[PDB]
Design a protein around this ligand. Structure first.
Ligand SMILES: [Mg+2]
Ligand SMILES: [Mg+2]
Ligand SMILES: [Mg+2]
Ligand SMILES: [Mg+2]
Ligand SMILES: [Mg+2]
Lengths: 55, 100, 117, 51, 88
RNA sequence: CUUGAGUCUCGUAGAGGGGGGUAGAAUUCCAGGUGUAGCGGUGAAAUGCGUAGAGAUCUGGAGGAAUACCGGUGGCGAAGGCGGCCCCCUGGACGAAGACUGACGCUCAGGUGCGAAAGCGUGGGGAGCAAACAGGAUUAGAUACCCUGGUAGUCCACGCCGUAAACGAUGUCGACUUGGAGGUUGUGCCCUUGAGGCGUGGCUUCCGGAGCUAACGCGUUAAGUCGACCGCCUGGGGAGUAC
């Protein structure tokens, strides 16, 4: 998570639709969620992850 | 100076200049007394979403040390040079060697 | 006619109406069914039990081409988003990839106010 | 959203992604934005988000 | 702010005594510096109605602490300002 | 002289600010194919758009604005207010050890600066929304609510206006006075030997105790008990109007 290249252990947090899952469903400890969401978003821009299923 | 972690995706159909390309970079850090404590040449890789045609690119890590001025030049040369599409250049992030 | 066997059929479910357009494989019309032009409309239309009749009505106005297996594409919260589908799984049509397209802007446009009834 | 699952039948399952979009994410929009109305309700529902 | 490598320098030049961050001589210099630098920065944008506040907060202290000298040891006041040309 | 306040060192989180690039989703428009008698809208309707081929469906292109999920009683800021991503310049806050300064502080009429939204000037910009306005509808009437359209504006750069239920309707600083559960963010420590067990700070919600209060309620983030300084109130309408 600390990075984005972690595409492997990253998609796990994001849903099928590419949408990042909250916490009441995960519990990735808020403090880390910050780095999580930021990492994912900035990553999708590198084609490492799809902005959404459709495209 | 300062640490970095740039990442560019070169068109697969032009994956031949990728090697020579890295050179300019490696040199644009030599005389600048900078350093490259990383270099993950991901090479080819399927693209999640299509970026103006083509579902694959050529990823090449970086992580330099040279001052901002020089690295800035890379951003400019990256643009005009259509050999590479999307890019990204973050700062220090406390130098990271190998792995990733 | 052309004989495709493998085609699609998007469902446009609008809060007031719904139209079933059975497209080919690369996106080509082949017959469109409309809830409005189903011999009924107004408060009678819109409803599932009604707006669906249009969907299955495609058969006697689409199957003329000859199709078997096919996927489905839903787009619209209209009161038929689902009802319409059942008619397909009962009219003889097979079934395959059922995906929802329904658009959702990542907060870009700005919808109109109104609605002060 | 995607669906394939073989095995001959037609039960439903149209409730999978359903509970993650539907006329919900839609109803969420369509009409004028809330601007300030959310900061209140979205933060007023919490009053119940406790008891 | 000023490079960590900077403050540690000025201090050893103005600090009343060898390596000391507290006296006016050191206080002022350390302040005037960031003030002179930011001047250029502000010559750009000039719309940062926030960063500018800090510029004031610290500047308002410059004339402020500078008074301490008068109210106290005046002998140095003039000897300190004559260094950065401040006050004028 | 050092506990107030301040500097140095090292780190900590964040939508704090200004600038410059960039990304994907969607609407609108334009273009081309497919295909045909409807679409759109409403309580119904009608105006409007359709055979000059719309709508839908698919392919290509242009452009503007906004940044879904995350996201939250979450965070940052003096307040106003501030959300994709990246870079550059830059403000504040906070914790850790000490080191240094040595009352250098608090408040503040006047004075100076910042100011939501609308609005104003100059030049740009214009997709969506929409004052004005024009139709359609409702009605006894309907200069409205509703529908179809739609200009200013909303966007940008510079300059101006300075107002708001600018609201916690609660000036700032400091000192104290039972506690309970949660949030968030530093740091010390415990088979760390777990997620965790025990401390100590910064900010923050809900509850409530003595007390305070006309009551509602406030209750260590007070409306409790004290102090320093400032702003203001003195029946309602006339009127925040007139000169
Ligand atoms: Mg209207
Ligand atoms: Mg605050
Ligand atoms: Mg304005
Ligand atoms: Mg104007
Ligand atoms: Mg209470």
């Amino acid at each position: 998570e600390i990075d984005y290249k972690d595409i492997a252990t990253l998609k796990n947090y994001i849903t099928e639709s590419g949408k990042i899952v909250p916490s009441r469903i995960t519990g990735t400890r808020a403090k880390y969620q910050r780095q999580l969401a930021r990492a994912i978003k900035r990553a999708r821009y590198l084609s490492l992850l799809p902005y959404t299923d459709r495209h | 100076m300062r640490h970095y972690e740039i990442v560019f995706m070169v068109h697969p159909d032009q994956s031949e200049q990728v090697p020579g390309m890295i050179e300019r970079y490696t040199a644009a850090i030599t005389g600048a007394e900078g350093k490259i404590h990383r270099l993950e040449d991901w090479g080819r890789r399927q693209l999640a979403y299509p970026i103006n045609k083509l579902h694959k690119a050529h990823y090449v890590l970086m992580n330099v040390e040279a001052p901002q001025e020089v690295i800035d030049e890379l951003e400019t040369t990256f643009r005009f040079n259509d050999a590479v599409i999307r890019s990204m250049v973050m700062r220090t992030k406390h130098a990271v060697t190998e792995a990733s | 006619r052309k004989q495709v066997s493998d085609g699609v059929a998007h469902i446009h479910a609008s809060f007031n109406n719904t139209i079933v357009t059975i497209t080919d494989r690369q996106g080509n019309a082949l017959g469109w069914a409309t809830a409005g032009g189903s011999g009924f409309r107004g408060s009678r239309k819109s409803t599932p039990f009604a707006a669906q009749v249009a969907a299955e009505r495609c058969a006697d106005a689409v199957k003329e081409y000859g199709i078997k297996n096919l996927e489905v594409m839903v787009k619209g919260p209209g009161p038929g988003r689902e009802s319409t589908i059942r008619a397909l799984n009962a009219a003889g049509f097979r079934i395959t990839n059922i995906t929802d397209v329904t658009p959702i802007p990542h907060n870009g446009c700005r919808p109109p106010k109104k609605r002060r009834v | 959203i995607k669906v394939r699952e073989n095995e001959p039948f037609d039960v439903a399952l149209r409730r999978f992604k359903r509970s993650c979009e539907k006329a919900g994410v839609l109803a969420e929009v369509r009409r004028r934005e809330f601007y300030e109305k959310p900061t209140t309700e979205r933060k007023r529902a919490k009053a119940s988000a406790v008891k | 702010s000023l490079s960590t490598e900077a403050t540690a320098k000025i201090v050893s030049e103005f600090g009343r005594d060898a390596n000391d961050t507290g006296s006016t001589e050191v206080q002022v210099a350390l302040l005037t510096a960031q003030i002179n630098h930011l001047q250029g920065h502000f010559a750009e944008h000039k719309k940062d109605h926030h960063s500018r506040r800090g510029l004031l907060r610290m500047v308002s202290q410059r004339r402020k602490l500078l008074d301490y000298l008068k109210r106290k040891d005046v002998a140095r006041y003039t000897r300190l300002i004559e260094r950065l040309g401040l006050r004028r």
